[PDB]
């Protein structure tokens, strides 16, 4: 099998150690490290990678990522010229992706992986136990949308659908690196489109639980603007009813992942007040009244009880419809709109307890599902 | 929709108070229940039903059971005389199934199927949080069952394969009783055909949480000596990879149920070194000698620590090759063994808590598919 | 015994009820209720009592409270009323106190207090599970000034050193009537100087545990300011080593206890940026300067990060020595300074889960009991 | 300070590890391993001694127990030539006891107990979290024998009054080393000595936790019997009213902790047949009915149901009035006596849950002291 670390910016020993780890395992071929550029990191694995392929017998390389997108050049670049370089420069039959600033990195994300490849499936996506407050693009983002847009089909049912630590084989990766769609979502993203076109396919799934968690480094509103806009350009996307899919029961969450704070909220309240604009204040015209008159408030004072549950789908429905990406108001103003609803879910559900918040969120997506189906 | 309660011997106000609630229910055209005999319950709900669908305006109706399989007459021909009733005497769209016995019955049973039905499901099973030493015929022996000889379907996935609260629509039914196998199971057997026939035609599968458990009445021995049958009867079938099979999210257990202890455990050890025979300790000769030594030595005083996971599948295995249903031997040396699997599970398992116990019995199903998916 | 119900504003079947569960008692031989005033509960009262003590046998009245103290008349004046009733015009051993907003009493409640009271303790207190941000009075004013002030005492132990559910003896009742400190407490003062004077007496103490909880009605800032001010009074009074304290051991915190939310964020956000005045931006001069610029923020937008718990222990001695009690500008600082401790706590603490929050507070008394006997 | 680790039979480089984190810990002064006889683990210490206390600075050394008691000679003769130690060949101001077992041993431990001596107390003593299963002595034994004869004290609300782990003042030191009855208790009595004389003088006592819980090696029979023998021989001792006691706020238990079994139940249930004598069941004529005739059915199978709570009380006064230490038929008696407790609470409490499991064992302290008050 091939190993692949896409990295940006990181700590040389963070990813130097994912690198050794992979290399040593008994069922990885070959590790391959996909640069943003040519920094310290870089030049750091290079000056590694003679050593540790010796150490091992596996062998270690580093590349530039290679152009093959059309958006912003960002992480999908460096995911589809690892694929490519899968699919053309190797015979290997399997490659799994792990984010490089994992330090929570052990043998056995390698084996649960590789055992879930042997028994079938042909994706296998890791997921993790995740703090309250965290992934809240996951949630209010792309599982939202998988549940407006597809309601009856696998793709809201994805744990983690913008994971980026996953084992394909050969044939998946030959189908994904193939569309036009993939192809070009050279920046954040990736992920959604890997879980859109694997699930449209009807690629069978198996979701692996790795119950320590994934600890990593500690931008967002880039994320945020490219995930939404990832799901925006599928919106008109047709999906067949589900393929297998299966996913390993979960453990209880640790204590210490339970028991952490996603965000600073004075600062997010404060943010929330920033950058105005006349014509941000023009867009929400489009919105309905609540949601309009709540956000105008933000001018003055945070604001965020009115961006419920149903203020949210309304919104999302506004966002899919005239969202202009690369336009900065709208940027801006889908960067206020999911604060809000972030806000507005912390306060009335993530402070009720951790429980509380998981059977909301599943509750969330059934209830939007649900709606979804009704129209 | 037609919705129905299987009676035996039931307190008349536990039953008739279930009946009220499926009547008043706006979704509930027709209500009927399907006893046993003659009993008092019957003439009970008999006299009472003119009044209750005068009240609601839904009507209600009760019936002896028809004899139409060929086992035991027991549940089987109870709810296959409800299908028979509802698909050739009634024009209704679906179906539902409830145990009389149930005393946390509200409208909300009926709601949730009703909308997982709109979804578009076949059927709709509903399942419940569940005391750790409860479903020991669930767990170690349908769910073992299942994974055991159909590793890579749906079956082993299904939460409460003995589960009798279900939604089927009208053309799932009408399958069902259609089809040999499912129609001559008159008795306990009768819910492990019902799931092991829908995944086998390729039914689509929801199951629905109903988060404050199934509180009932509180035999045993009858119950799993006829499922351990049908599932030998099902042993040669082929089935293939699954249809579509969704899980509403667990909530978290409630305290009363985690806290409750489902048997009398110096009474089972007790009971462990009764009804011995000469034939029943020469049949253990056919088990592996672990087994066969450990099972011996209750004649003289309990022992159980032999009887592990790997222990019990190669006991499984042995059973499914000889056991002889009807034989007094054979029903009285399985019960035997699974009580010792139970005590087992319970001193080693059980007693670490209830989320250990959890994470172990869904461990032991996923061990379990990975053995038979070897051979 | 008898037991006494102190009412202001109070739903008449609520308190009926309260009553004639102790009416009912068997070791209840009078009730008395205290009204505020003679409104629309006091004259249902009035005309419930004559056919309740005739049904129990026990006998039941209500009167308005006296002046007996110096400050505002509030609860004060209520519960001495009922302690000056007790000795002066009654013959009873032991007095109960219970809020009269109660809906979760039960005859229990008076059995445990009665059997610690038999055991030979003179003060008992009942204590309750509570949700993560309820009692932010009780954490961050009285205990924590207990502890700042009294580090080598019981004081900050106790529990619930507000709590209006208590049992004393004749004795015990005597010498708080007989204090002119408690005498003159007829504000939200009261509790804070029962509390104090008993451990300052050496009374022996025993804090009972209502696993239920203490379901009541849902004036903060009154309750705030006086409930400050009886600490402020106290502040140079010595206090012996500890007598007899002990508490009954607490059970799991009720899962609809720990999932509740203490209050409105937004609400509260907003409220910190009104009832401004240039005294009070003048009166910030006397605090330290990450308090006075935080605080001072507050003007133009919500500002709470800076008041963590070194902060707030500043902040208090500064209050201790500055804070004039009826000065409306010396009140609305309180109030601001104390919410933005409540958010702060909320956000970094709170958010955390519920077990998190009660470790850290017990800590954070220990961090400040250390602190105090540091000086 | 003074650190001492009294040893018997243990793994070198455990003790070794222990000993080294003594020393290098700033306020420790001297370390003193005690050893029963001159075997591998005092040789290996030995020559070790001399090497840490070169690298560290502070004086180690070993000496063999000297025979100071008068019963067995065990660990009390080990802790009481420490104490001779301490108070007659060093000037040091404290002493500190730990198992030399202990494999979760940090500077913790002593920072911890330091800072509470710092405070004022005169015995600190350690206490951790434990599994639901363990600490069957210290609950149905010594906390139970607490509650039972001295009902308005102390010492039942001691956490764990068998605990090694224990700081202790020269004059705590000296005041028990001058007491005849607890020089005298050479075997494992000394721990329960120690708790009950120092409660008995009103010396201030402190109990920190520990929130990592004890790790240590995994006989029980003599530990059993001569702690019941300690405090039968206590049982006219007449003890005032409370000294100080504090005792930290406990965090939630550890998972691994809460998840872990304390014993092997077949075996157990085996041993509760064996080892029976015509005289065993002659002396059970001395026991109430239900107990009389449920350990007679022992000898033919196991049976425990019949020794709940009440029925433990009555088989305990029994014991304190009618056992002989050093008889082997009483001795084994109480250990069959008891099994059954365990057994008993192991199936109808411990089975619930870790949480169920301490409330009632709390309530059950409660249970007796009310029920002790009485008579
Ligand atoms: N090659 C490449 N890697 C990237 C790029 N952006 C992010 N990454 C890497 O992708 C992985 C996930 O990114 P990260 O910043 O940790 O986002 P996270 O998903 O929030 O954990 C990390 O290894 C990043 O170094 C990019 O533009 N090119
Ligand atoms: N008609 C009919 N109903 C039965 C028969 N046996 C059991 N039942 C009913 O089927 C439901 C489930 O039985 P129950 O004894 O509660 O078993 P359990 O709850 O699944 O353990 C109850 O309503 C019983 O009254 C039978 O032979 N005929
Ligand atoms: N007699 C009298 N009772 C009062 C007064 N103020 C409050 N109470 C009562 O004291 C009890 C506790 O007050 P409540 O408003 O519920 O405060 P809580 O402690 O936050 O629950 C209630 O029974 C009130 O009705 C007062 O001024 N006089
Ligand atoms: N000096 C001495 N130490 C002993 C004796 N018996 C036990 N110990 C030690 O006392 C400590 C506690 O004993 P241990 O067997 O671990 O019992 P437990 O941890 O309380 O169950 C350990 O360090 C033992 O090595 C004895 O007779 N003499
Ligand atoms: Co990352
Ligand atoms: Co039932
Ligand atoms: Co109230
Ligand atoms: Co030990």
């Known amino acids: 099998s091939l190993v692949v670390f896409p990295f940006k910016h990181e700590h040389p020993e963070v990813l130097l150690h994912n690198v050794r780890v992979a290399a040593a395992h008994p069922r990885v071929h070959e590790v391959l490290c996909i640069g943003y550029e040519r920094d310290q990191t870089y030049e750091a694995v290079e000056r590694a990678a003679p050593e540790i392929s010796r150490a091992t017998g596996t062998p270690v390389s580093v590349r530039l990522q290679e152009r093959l997108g059309t958006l912003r050049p960002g992480k999908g670049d460096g995911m589809n010229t690892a694929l490519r370089y899968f699919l053309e420069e190797t015979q290997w039959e399997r490659i799994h992706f792990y984010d490089a600033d994992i330090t929570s990195f052990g043998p056995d994300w390698i084996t ?14 890791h997921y993790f136990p995740r703090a309250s407050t965290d992934a809240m693009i996951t949630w209010m983002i792309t599982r939202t949308g998988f549940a407006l847009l597809w309601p009856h089909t696998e793709l809201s049912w994805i744990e983690q659908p913008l994971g980026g630590e996953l084992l394909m084989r050969r044939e998946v990766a030959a189908m994904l690196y193939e569309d036009e769609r993939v192809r070009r979502r050279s920046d954040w993203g990736i992920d959604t489109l890997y879980t859109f076109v694997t699930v449209q396919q009807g690629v069978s799934i198996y979701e692996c639980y790795i119950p320590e968690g994934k600890a990593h480094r500690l931008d967002l509103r880039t994320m945020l603007v490219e995930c939404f806009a990832a799901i925006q350009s599928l919106q008109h996307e047709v999906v067949g009813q589900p393929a297998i899919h299966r996913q390993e029961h979960p453990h209880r969450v640790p204590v210490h992942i339970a028991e952490r704070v996603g965000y600073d909220v004075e600062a997010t309240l404060h943010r929330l007040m920033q950058h105005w604009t006349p014509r941000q204040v023009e867009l929400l015209e489009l919105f309905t009244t609540p949601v309009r008159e709540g956000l105008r408030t933000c001018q003055r ?20 419809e005239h969202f202009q990406p690369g336009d900065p108001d709208w940027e801006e103003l889908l960067f206020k709109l999911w604060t809000t609803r972030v806000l507005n879910y912390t306060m009335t559900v993530a402070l009720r307890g951790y429980d509380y918040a998981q059977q909301y969120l599943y509750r969330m997506l059934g209830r939007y599902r ?3 189906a009704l129209e």
């Open 112 to 125: 649960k992986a590789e055992e879930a490849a042997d028994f079938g499936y042909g994706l296998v996506r």
């Open 301 to 320: 004072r945070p604001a965020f009880n009115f961006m419920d549950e149903m203020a949210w789908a309304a919104t999302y429905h506004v966002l899919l």
């Open 370 to 372: 649900y709606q979804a």
